[PDB]
Amino acid sequence: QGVNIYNISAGTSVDLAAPVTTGDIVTFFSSAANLNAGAGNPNNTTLNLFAENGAYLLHIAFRLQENVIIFNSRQPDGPWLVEQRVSDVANQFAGIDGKAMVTVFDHGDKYQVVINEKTVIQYTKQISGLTSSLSYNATEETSIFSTVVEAVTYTGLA
Amino acid sequence: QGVNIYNISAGTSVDLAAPVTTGDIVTFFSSAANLNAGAGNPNNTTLNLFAENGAYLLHIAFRLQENVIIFNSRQPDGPWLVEQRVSDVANQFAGIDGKAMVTVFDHGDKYQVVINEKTVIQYTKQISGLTSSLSYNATEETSIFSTVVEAVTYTGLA
C-alpha cells in the first residue's frame, strides 16, 4: 500500500515516516559486497530496526574475522539479550555477487531475515512493537556494504 | 515469504523463478534518474510485467519529449489496449533525487504503481494472470535509468 525510501550512510540512523509493523517489509540495498574487507572492530557492519523508544528490536552484526552473523535485541540502556549466531558470512551471501540486499519481514512473533535470496534465520522476537527507525553502522574502511545503503519499506500490507 | 533478485540490463528480459501473483510486489531499482536525457524513440525507457505467454500484463513507457508516462497492456501478437496516461514525468519522480525505484503491487483486479514514494496510478488490469517474466527496454544513450536495473520480487505474501 505504501513505499518509503531512505538513504542511510554508514554510521547513521533514519526515522521512518511510516513505521513498519506486522505484515510489513524492509529491504536494505548495498551496491557493494566487500566480503574480503579488513577486520571489524569488532563489527564490520550492523543493520538495525529500532523501536519508538530506541530499543534495538533487531540487531544484525556482520563480523568477517569471527566469520559469523550475530542477531540480537536490547533496550537503550539495557544489555544484549539472547544471542543467535549464523556461521559463515560469505555463505549467506552466495547466489548474488557484487552487491547485496537484506530483507526483513515482520511476522509479528518473529522477523524473517533474507540475505539476497536466502532466508538466513527466522528470528524469534525478544522485544516486540513497531519499527520506528533504522540504522546502518560501519567504519569508512571495513564495511561489507557501500558507504550508502538504500532502505525501502513496504507498509500497510496487512 | 520469498525474495528473488534479478539484474536486468537495458533492452533485455528475465524469467522469474517465483512468479508474481495477487498480493505480491516487484520493485525495479535504478541507480540513476536521467530526467534530462535526449528524446526517446519514442520511449526513453519501458518497464514490463509479462504473462506466461509473453503478453504485456503491464507496460510502463516513459517519454520525456511527450512528457508523459504511458500505461497499457497487450497480447504478444495483439494491439495495445486502452491507453492510460500520466502527464509530467519529472513530477512523478519528485521527492527522491539522483536515483529511482518503481514498485508494482499486484492487487488482483489492479496494479498499484508507485514511483519512488508516490502512487502514480491504480491501473485497472486489462489482461489478468500471474507475472512470469520482466523486462527493461531503452537505448544506451537515452534511458532515464541506469544501464542495469535491479528487480526484486517479494512473493508468497498472500
A 104-133 residues inside an 8 A Cβ radius of B:
105, 112, 114, 116-117
User: Looking at the partner chain, which of B29, B114, B154 has a beta carbon nearest the beta carbon of A29?
Assistant: B29
Looking at the DSSP bridge assignments, the partners of residue B137 are B46
Q: What are phi and psi of B111, to 5 degrees?
A: -120, 125
How many CA atoms within 13 Å lie on the side-chain side of A62? Answer: 29
Nearest beta carbon to residue A117 from set B4, B25, B99? B4
Contact A146, A31 (CB under 8 A): yes
Size of interface A-B (CB pairs under 8 A): 47
CA distance B33 to B97: 7
CB contact under 8 A, A117 and B31: no
For residue A106, what is the nearest residue in chain B, using CA coordinates? B1
d(C-alpha B2, C-alpha B26), whole Å = 12
Query: In terms of CATH architecture, what is B1-158?
Result: Sandwich (2.60)
Cα dist from A29 to A48, B77, B137, whole Å: 14, 38, 23
CA distance A2 to A149: 20
Contacts of A1 in chain B (CB under 8 A): 105, 112
**Do the beta carbons of residue A104 and residue A4 sit within 8 Å?**
no
